[PDB]
Amino acid sequence: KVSEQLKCCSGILKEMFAKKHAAYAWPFYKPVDVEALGLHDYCDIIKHPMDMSTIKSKLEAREYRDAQEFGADVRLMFSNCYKYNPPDHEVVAMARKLQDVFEMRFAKMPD
Ligand SMILES: CNC(=O)CN(CC(c1ccccc1)c1ccccc1)C(=O)c1cc(C)c(OC)c(C)c1
C-alpha cells in the first residue's frame, strides 16, 4: 500500500519519461548544465535544484518515505522552473504541460 504508492510513483516517472510527452518533457530529464548554458545566477536563485533523473535515482535509492515526499520533489522541479525563468519563456509552457500529466496521474494514485 505504501510500497504500492511508491510503485505507482515509479509508474508516474515512466509516463513523464515516455515518448508521448518528450516534445515538452525533455528540458526536465537531466540537471541544468550551468557551465554549458552560462547560467551563473541559477545556484543563487534556485537553492534546491531538481530534475527527473535525480528523482528517479532517489526513488531507486529509497530516499522517499511515501508518495507525498516523491510528489514534493516533482513539484520542486516545476516550482524552480516557474521561479527562475521569465513567465513567457517556452520552458514555462513546457513545465505546465508536463505538470498537467503529473498532477492527473498523482491524483488517481490508489489508497
Ligand atoms: C538538455 N538541455 C536542456 O535541458 C536545456 N535547458 C532547457 C532550455 C530550453 C527549454 C525550452 C526551450 C528552449 C530552450 C533552456 C536553456 C536556458 C534557459 C532556459 C531554458 C535547460 O538546461 C534548462 C534550463 C532552465 C533554466 C530550466 O529551468 C529551471 C530548465 C527546466 C531546463
Swiss-Prot record:
Tissue expression profile of the protein: Ubiquitously expressed.
Query: Which residues are connected by disulfide bridges in this protein?
Result: none
The observed outcome of changing Y82C is: In CDLS6; likely pathogenic; reduced acetylated histone binding
Also noted in the record is: JQ1, a thieno-triazolo-1,4-diazepine derivative, and I-BET, a benzodiazepine derivative, have been tested on tumors with success. Treatment with GSK1210151A (I-BET151, a I-BET derivative) has strong effets on mixed lineage leukemia and promotes myeloid differentiation and leukemia stem-cell depletion.
What remark about domains does the record contain? The NET domain mediates interaction with a number of chromatin proteins involved in transcription regulation (NSD3, JMJD6, CHD4, GLTSCR1 and ATAD5).
The free-text function statement in the UniProt record for this protein reads: Chromatin reader protein that recognizes and binds acetylated histones and plays a key role in transmission of epigenetic memory across cell divisions and transcription regulation. Remains associated with acetylated chromatin throughout the entire cell cycle and provides epigenetic memory for postmitotic G1 gene transcription by preserving acetylated chromatin status and maintaining high-order chromatin structure. During interphase, plays a key role in regulating the transcription of signal-inducible genes by associating with the P-TEFb complex and recruiting it to promoters.
Name this polypeptide is given: Bromodomain-containing protein 4
The record lists the organism as Homo sapiens (Human)
Could you read off the lineage of the organism from its UniProt record?
Eukaryota, Metazoa, Chordata, Craniata, Vertebrata
Q: Which gene encodes it?
A: BRD4
